[PDB]
Write an enzyme that holds these catalytic residues in place. Structure first.
Site, mmCIF file in Angstrom:
data_model
loop_
_atom_site.group_PDB
_atom_site.id
_atom_site.type_symbol
_atom_site.label_atom_id
_atom_site.label_comp_id
_atom_site.label_asym_id
_atom_site.label_seq_id
_atom_site.Cartn_x
_atom_site.Cartn_y
_atom_site.Cartn_z
ATOM 1 C CB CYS A 107 -0.936 0.068 1.216
ATOM 2 S SG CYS A 107 -2.008 1.537 1.086
ATOM 3 N NE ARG B 198 2.311 0.696 3.568
ATOM 4 C CZ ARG B 198 3.442 0.062 3.829
ATOM 5 N NH1 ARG B 198 3.608 -0.540 5.002
ATOM 6 N NH2 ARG B 198 4.408 0.029 2.907
ATOM 7 C CD1 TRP C 126 -6.861 9.201 -1.795
ATOM 8 C CD2 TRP C 126 -8.099 9.189 0.082
ATOM 9 N NE1 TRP C 126 -6.047 9.583 -0.755
ATOM 10 C CE2 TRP C 126 -6.779 9.583 0.406
ATOM 11 C CE3 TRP C 126 -9.056 9.114 1.108
ATOM 12 C CZ2 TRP C 126 -6.390 9.891 1.715
ATOM 13 C CZ3 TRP C 126 -8.672 9.426 2.402
ATOM 14 C CH2 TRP C 126 -7.351 9.809 2.696
ATOM 15 C CD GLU D 197 -5.332 2.657 -7.088
ATOM 16 O OE1 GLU D 197 -6.000 1.621 -6.839
ATOM 17 O OE2 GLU D 197 -5.305 3.652 -6.327
#
Ligand code: HEM
Ligand code: A1A0K
Ligand code: H4B
Ligand code: ZN
Length: 411
Positions: free
Chosen positions: A109, A112, A281, A286
Site C-alpha cells: 500500500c 499508508r 481514495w 490505478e
C-alpha cells in the site's frame, strides 16, 4: 541483522530494526527471490494463544501500558476464553487498533501515511446478508462523504468453524460489469467477466452495457450468497474529461469514486475476518494506467491514440506512452474539478517517502513492496523508484484469500 535501506535520489539512509518483529514468511529463500510473484504461498487453540499474546502485547505497548495489570488481566482473560471456546473476541479498542495496523503493515500500500486515520465499522453483530448489505451501504455512504472521501473498514464476524464464513463475493464493493460478446470480445470490464456471470447465474438482470455497477454478492454465516443493488445515489461516479481535448468527452468514460477492496482477509491476534471491505481514495494511476490501459482491462490506448492522430504504424513512436500521459491528466482533472478525493502518483509517492521516514523513526522500519509501490507509469521520476525497501510480513495484516465460489460447499 539491523539492516540498512538506502535512497539513491537523495542519498538518504535509514536503519530497519522493525523487520526483526516479522514472523510470517515471504516466499524468498537465500537462493531465490520471489519479489515479483503476485500471490506467493481451520485453526486450533494451541496456535491461537501466542498470536493473541503477541497481539495483546503490542496493543498495550501502544497505549503505553505495556505489561501492566490491565494488560495481564486481559492476557489472562483471553487465555481462559481460548480455553473455554477455543477462540476469543476482540475488544472494540483492540479491533480498531488491529484493523489500523493491518493497513499500517500492508507493504504493497502506497497511501499508508493515512493509516491512523481509519474509520472502523464493527459489523460483528451481523447475522444475515441483508444486514451485510445494510452495513456496506452505510460504509459506502460514510466513506464517500459527498466526494470528500474517508478511509473506512467494515468488519463482519470472524471465521469460526470454516463452514460459517461471512464473505463478500465481489472483489470490490463497486466494480463495473464484464460482458463477453458473441463475436468474442468483451464489453464493460474483462476483469469481472466470471463474477458478472455468477451474478447472472444467481439471478442478476444485466443492463449489458459498459459502466454497469455490479450488484453485491453477500454470503452470511456460510449461507449461499444473495444479490443486492447498492442504491445508485450511493455510487459516486466521475465522468472523465480532458482539460484540452473535447473529444475526450465523447470518449464517454467514467470511474467510481470509491475504491473499496472486499475480497481480502483481515487477521488480528490470530482471528480471521473473511469479510472486511476497506476503502480509501484512488491514486490516479490505478484508473488511468491500469484500469483503462491494461491490455486485458479496458484497453483504451487504441482509441485515445487515434483521436490524437499519432504514429500508430510503428512501436518506437511511443504513441502508447503519449496517450497514457493524457489519459491520466484527464482522470486527475475530472476527479478534482468534481471535488472527489484523488491523489496523483507524484504526490502519493512523495507522501510514502515522508511516511517511510516517520515509520523508521518512531517504529524502526516500514515494510514495503517496491514492485507494488512504484507507480505503473513514470517509474523513475517518482521518488519511490529510487528508494530501497525491505519487504517483510508483520501482523496484524490483510491477506489474500481464495474466491468463495471455488470453496463454497453449495446447495
Ligand atoms: C487512503 C488512501 C489510499 C491510497 C491512496 C491507497 C493506495 C493504494 C494503491 C495504489 C494500491 C495498489 C492497488 C493496485 O495496484 O491494485 C494499494 C493496495 C493496497 N492497500 Fe492501499 N490505498 C489507500 C487506502 C487503504 C486502506 C484504507 C487500506 C486498509 C484498511 C489499504 C490497504 C491496502 C491493501 C490490502 C492493498 C492491496 C495489497 C494486495 O493487493 O496484495 N489501503 N493501495
Ligand atoms: C483501499 C484502496 C485504495 C486504493 N487506492 N486502491 C485499492 C485497490 C487495491 C487493489 C488490490 N488487490 C485487491 C488486487 C485493487 C484495486 F482495484 C484497488 F482499487 C484499495
Ligand atoms: C508480475 C507482477 O508481479 C504484477 O504485474 C504486479 C506488479 N506490480 C504491481 N503493482 C501494483 N500496484 N499493482 C499491480 O497489480 C501490480 N502487478
Ligand atoms: Zn526477495
Amino acid at each position: 541483522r539491523f539492516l540498512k535501506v538506502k535512497n539513491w535520489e537523495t542519498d538518504v539512509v535509514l536503519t530497519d530494526t522493525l523487520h526483526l518483529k516479522s514472523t510470517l514468511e515471504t516466499g524468498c529463500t537465500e537462493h531465490i527471490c520471489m519479489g515479483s510473484i503476485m500471490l506467493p504461498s481451520v485453526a486450533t487453540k494451541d496456535q491461537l494463544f501466542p498470536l493473541a499474546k503477541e497481539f495483546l502485547d503490542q496493543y498495550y505497548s501502544s497505549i503505553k501500558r505495556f505489561g501492566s495489570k490491565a494488560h495481564m488481566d486481559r492476557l489472562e482473560e483471553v487465555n481462559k476464553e481460548i480455553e473455554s471456546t477455543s477462540t476469543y473476541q476482540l475488544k472494540d479498542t483492540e479491533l480498531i487498533y488491529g484493523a489500523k495496523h493491518a493497513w499500517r503493515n500492508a507493504s504493497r500500500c502506497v497511501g499508508r501515511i493515512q493509516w491512523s486515520k481509519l474509520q472502523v465499522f464493527d459489523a460483528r453483530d451481523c447475522t444475515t446478508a441483508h444486514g451485510m448489505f445494510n452495513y456496506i451501504c452505510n460504509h459506502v455512504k460514510y466513506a464517500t462523504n459527498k466526494g470528500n472521501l474517508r478511509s473506512a473498514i467494515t468488519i463482519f464476524p470472524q471465521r469460526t468453524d470454516g463452514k460459517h464464513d461471512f464473505r463478500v463475493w465481489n472483489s470490490q464493493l463497486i466494480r463495473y460489469a464484464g460482458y463477453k460478446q458473441p463475436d468474442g470480445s468483451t464489453l464493460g470490464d474483462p476483469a469481472n467477466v466470471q463474477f458478472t456471470e455468477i451474478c447472472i447465474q444467481q439471478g442478476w438482470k444485466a443492463p449489458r452495457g459498459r459502466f454497469d455497477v455490479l450488484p453485491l454478492l453477500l454470503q452470511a454465516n456460510g449461507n449461499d450468497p444473495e444479490l443486492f443493488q447498492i442504491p445508485p445515489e450511493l455510487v459516486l461516479e466521475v465522468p472523465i474529461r480532458h482539460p484540452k481535448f473535447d473529444w475526450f468527452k465523447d470518449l464517454g468514460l467514467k470511474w467510481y469514486g470509491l475504491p473499496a477492496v472486499s475480497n481480502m482477509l483481515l487477521e488480528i491476534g490470530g482471528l480471521e475476518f473473511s469479510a472486511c471491505p476497506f476503502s480509501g481514495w484512488y491514486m490516479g494511476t490505478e484508473i488511468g494506467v491500469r484500469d483503462y490501459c491494461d491490455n486485458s482491462r479496458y484497453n483504451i490506448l487504441e482509441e485515445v491514440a487515434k483521436k490524437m492522430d499519432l504514429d500508430m504504424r510503428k512501436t518506437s513512436s511511443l504513441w502508447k506512452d503519449q496517450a497514457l500521459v493524457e489519459i491520466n491528466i484527464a482522470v486527475l482533472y475530472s476527479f478534482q474539478s468534481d471535488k472527489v478525493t484523488i491523489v496523483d502518483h507524484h504526490s502519493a509517492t512523495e507522501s510514502f517517502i515522508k511516511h517511510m521516514e516517520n515509520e523508521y523513526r518512531c517504529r524502526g522500519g516500514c515494510p514495503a513492496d517496491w514492485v507494488w509501490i512504484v507507480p505503473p507509469m513514470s517509474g523513475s521520476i517518482t521518488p519511490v523508484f529510487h528508494q530501497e525497501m525491505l519487504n517483510y510480513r508483520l501482523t496484524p495484516s490483510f491477506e489474500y484469500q481464495p474466491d468463495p465460489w471455488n470453496t463454497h460447499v453449495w446447495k
